[PDB]
């Protein structure tokens, strides 16, 4: 469980457009290290993790200290927000 | 129906804190004119519109050209985002 931001836009978005939207939001909180992405419409994920097993893109991100989930329509982006501290 | 951003934070937020969070997000898209606010925990709304009838704070905002709804935990903020166009 991490902080979450869910964006629902009336227009359709591409992966690139959604990522730009997500990175723009993340940037208000610090240095946004994008760890993983998932497309809930197509099943696509990055990095290439398949068959291992339940939501592997999320498990991957959480194991790398993900602390902010940003969804933009069908896309979910998992960030580690780094701060100067 | 307008574009929506829903923020779910692990920490508890005050009205002032939630408004600051919302205004900060809105600012990436243009000049954020805050039209109305509602607290879903207490029933509080601004401006002072009561008994008129279903979600009057939302009706008020929509009649003033609200185009972005930002929720921060229990709070909902309705903005008219103005652009230079």
From Swiss-Prot, chains A, B:
InterPro entries: DUF5619
Highest rank taxon of the organism: Archaea
Protein name (Swiss-Prot/TrEMBL): Uncharacterized protein AF_1514
């Amino acid at each position: 469980i991490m902080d979450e931001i869910k964006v629902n836009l009336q227009k359709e978005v591409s992966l690139e457009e959604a990522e730009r939207y997500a990175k723009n939001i993340a940037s208000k909180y610090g240095d946004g290290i994008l760890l993983s992405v998932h497309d809930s419409k197509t099943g696509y994920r990055a990095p290439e993790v398949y068959c291992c097993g339940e939501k592997p893109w999320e498990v991957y991100a959480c194991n790398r200290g993900a602390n902010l989930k940003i969804s933009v329509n069908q896309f979910e982006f998992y960030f580690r927000i780094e701060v100067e501290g």
